[PDB]
Design an enzyme around this catalytic site. Structure first.
Site, PDB file in Angstrom:
ATOM      1  CG  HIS A  94       3.564  11.193  -3.566  1.00 39.58           C
ATOM      2  ND1 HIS A  94       1.984  11.715  -3.456  1.00 39.58           N
ATOM      3  CD2 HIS A  94       3.278   9.832  -3.030  1.00 39.58           C
ATOM      4  CE1 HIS A  94       1.238  10.572  -3.001  1.00 39.58           C
ATOM      5  NE2 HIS A  94       2.282   9.546  -2.508  1.00 39.58           N
ATOM      6  CG  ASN A 109       7.342   5.307   5.121  1.00 33.27           C
ATOM      7  OD1 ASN A 109       7.466   6.555   5.888  1.00 33.27           O
ATOM      8  ND2 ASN A 109       6.458   5.151   4.327  1.00 33.27           N
ATOM      9  N   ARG A 128      12.638   8.047   5.924  1.00 35.52           N
ATOM     10  CA  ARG A 128      11.562   8.853   5.310  1.00 35.52           C
ATOM     11  C   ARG A 128      10.912   9.672   6.073  1.00 35.52           C
ATOM     12  NE  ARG A 147      -4.658  11.501   2.422  1.00 31.66           N
ATOM     13  CZ  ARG A 147      -3.555  11.229   2.443  1.00 31.66           C
ATOM     14  NH1 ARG A 147      -2.742  10.863   1.254  1.00 31.66           N
ATOM     15  NH2 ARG A 147      -2.842  11.057   3.529  1.00 31.66           N
ATOM     16  CD  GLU A 176       7.560   6.561  -2.916  1.00 33.57           C
ATOM     17  OE1 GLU A 176       6.891   5.995  -3.663  1.00 33.57           O
ATOM     18  OE2 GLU A 176       7.569   6.949  -1.695  1.00 33.57           O
TER      19      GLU A 176
END
Ligand code: AQP
Ligand code: AQP
Lengths: 394, 394
Positions: B172, B8, B83, B233, B378
């Site tokens: 996601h 990733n 990813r 965020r 993941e």
């Protein structure tokens, strides 16, 4: 029998109504359009559009003043109600207009500069022409001031809220207040022990969660731009997406602001009309972009209705109101079918009935939540606040 | 026994994992931090942070390459999984990396320019060092491509979608896909006849509605900025409000973009920390702004969970996952209590149990909807896609 004069000063126009104090009936209604422009005209009941070219907010209000004398009801005006766009954080209820209020309306004006100055122009004009007439300010926001911080705070840094006042305010309060009150009677609910969801759907569209008589969550934000997709407004829009468009097309912040206000929404997706009634016909005639615009519009409403239900302990009623809510059989059904998860069964006999049937339940008996249509009457609500405040001594 | 190498590449770092093909077990894990800067360092299992100052994406990947030889598993690497941040509209599932895909990843790159170039740097680096090793691209967005137009279209003018690709994509996906799959087993549900809501809650937070095995609605939009309030965020933010701040402080579009990304959210409201575990302690010690930040965070999650349920015909499960979802007893309870309207009763014995208890139901028996915690994996999901594609011949 005395009367109430209701005034809604937009940036472009002046809408008014004369309601009877005794019965809350509409005796007169009219519009003063094309304001501050080279050509300004007045139309009452659609009698004859008389045009007094190049006239300001005072001149047009003086024109209606002449017409109130003509129809011999000028001296019967006991109260004047003003619809205000943004009450900010200062106004929780309707108030009798005094110098203080005028300052306080000017103080919050920056939040909605375009619309609020028009309201202030109208308050001064009405004050000038009608001197010993009690005057009331009624705010689109006041009903939503019951919201808890968790419901009105944005993810933005605390500073913006504390020093600049950036929070959720919400609009259509008067309508939401009126409709909700009315729902307690129609549904035979105990106000203090209830949970209602109200969907005000017109050119401007917003949802409101009413728990135990109070507003606990609402669709629109600081400005009328947030929440549902509307006639010309985009609604819920990813800021990342917005800033990405800015870089990609070289458009300014003001450019994008015009786009989400006047070029987006139902008008935006369909690329045909902002009017829902027109788009309903286009679908019938096999227009995909109109069909999408409606399916999307339906979707964001169902999403926000369900979303707003979270702020209730129990869901007793879903109420439709506004131009679309009261009149569109299609949209009411599509939204409700999208909410099958909430255990709603619809009575399509009752959903087919036109708006002439007024306050009407549209849900079936096996339904876990009652659905109903309740025509909004903002003028009647502005009148009632004025009457009550008319009995007060200030 | 062969192994899978998961990669990733963020803008600032390179996260990796070496999983056993036979059992999907983690054999090794590490990070290559401070990328493209003056100082770059590698840490594996937290053994010894070895620092090869001023090194690019290829140099660090070559550093991990040395370490795979050191631990004598280099030649056992049968597959490499990448990813990818943004698959755009082109990728519906995971693919075996070929020249075509590389072009297609570059084609959608403008949508997420920062994050995607890093992914492409990593794909080339892994291609260079590992030549005859099959390589797989796995996209954060692919799972969400099942969404209908009504669910992914914005109120913006049609032009923006058709010519520039401005729509909801959602993120996601891999997690949402993994967790949802896992929920079918734990809840003993028929996949093709089900409706799940998944709440991935960590530093990045998003909701997903899974109807009959497919994603039908998701929290995030074009960028990870939309939806829930997160660590740094802001989430759902009124554009009117955003453009108002621009005029009031004279800030540029880029300025505001930095604010909603790195200065807002939990960090924004509390003015203390972006880390939830820290803010939980501050509340305990009587910090109001931390308590607000959590109450608000809880509120926007409950709002979006309920909101996303609309896109289901039936609500069978609400599943918590991610750093916060799997570990925070407080947030799980507060969110669920906020969803009492949906007829949920919580088992607080089961909600108290730490993440060591793995895949666990937390709802009581009188509850109309099953609540559960399912730890996301993941790397395991990226491995499984790679294994499957490993048996394919391309
Ligand atoms: N019979 C009908 N069938 C379907 N749609 C209908 C039918 N009649 C009207 N509409 C749609 O209603 C929208 C206008 O609603 P409105 O409530 O009259 O709009 P407004 O502007 O007067 O009130 P708002 O409450 O929107 O004011 P603001 O928010 O702007 O303050 C039309 O789209 C029409 O298609
Ligand atoms: N025991 C705990 N109790 C309460 N909160 C906890 C506890 N342990 C961790 N957290 C909170 O979880 C957040 C980090 O979650 P993450 O899932 O590890 O974050 P990530 O960045 O690794 O994964 P994301 O899924 O967010 O990745 P992106 O979205 O960025 O791609 C912390 O806030 C911590 O307080």
């Amino acid at each position: 029998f005395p009367v109430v004069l209701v005034i809604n000063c937009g940036s472009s126009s002046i809408k008014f109504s004369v309601l009877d104090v005794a019965t809350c009936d509409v005796l007169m209604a009219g519009i003063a359009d094309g304001m501050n422009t080279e050509n300004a005209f007045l139309s009452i009941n659609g009698d004859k559009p008389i045009n007094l070219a190049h006239s300001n907010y005072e001149d047009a209000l003086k024109a209606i003043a002449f017409e109130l004398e003509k129809r011999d009801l000028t001296d019967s005006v006991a109260l004047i109600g003003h619809r205000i766009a943004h009450g900010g954080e200062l106004f929780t209820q309707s108030v009798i207009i005094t110098d203080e209020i005028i300052d306080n309306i000017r103080r919050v004006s920056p939040l909605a500069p375009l619309h609020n100055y028009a309201n202030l122009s109208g308050i001064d004009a009405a004050r000038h022409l009608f001197p010993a007439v009690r005057q009331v300010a009624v705010f689109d926001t006041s009903f939503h001031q019951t919201l808890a911080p968790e419901a009105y705070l944005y993810g933005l840094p605390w500073e913006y809220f504390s020093s600049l006042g950036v929070r959720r305010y919400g609009f259509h309060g008067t309508s939401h207040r009126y409709v909700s009150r009315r729902a307690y009677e129609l549904l035979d609910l105990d106000e203090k022990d209830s949970g209602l969801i109200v969907a005000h759907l017109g050119n401007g569209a917003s949802i409101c969660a009413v728990r135990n008589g109070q507003s606990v969550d609402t669709s629109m934000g600081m400005t009328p731009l947030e929440g549902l997709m509307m006639g010309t407004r985009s609604g819920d829009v990813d800021f990342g997406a917005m800033a990405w468009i800015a870089k990609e097309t070289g458009q300014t912040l003001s450019d994008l602001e015009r786009v989400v206000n006047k070029e987006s929404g139902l008008l935006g997706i369909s690329g045909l009309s902002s009017d829902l009634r027109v788009l309903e016909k286009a679908w019938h005639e096999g227009h995909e972009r109109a069909r999408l615009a409606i399916k999307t519009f339906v979707h964001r409403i169902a999403r926000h209705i369900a979303g707003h239900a979270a702020s209730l302990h129990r869901l007793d009623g879903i109420i439709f109101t506004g131009g679309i809510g009261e009149n569109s059989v299609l949209i009411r059904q599509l939204v409700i079918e999208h909410l099958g998860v909430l255990g709603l069964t619809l009575d399509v006999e009752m959903n087919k009935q036109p708006n002439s049937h007024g306050e009407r339940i549209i849900s079936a008996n096996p339904s876990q939540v009652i659905c109903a249509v309740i025509p909004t009457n903002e003028e009647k609500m502005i009148a009632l606040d004025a009457i009550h405040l008319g009995n007060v001594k200030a």
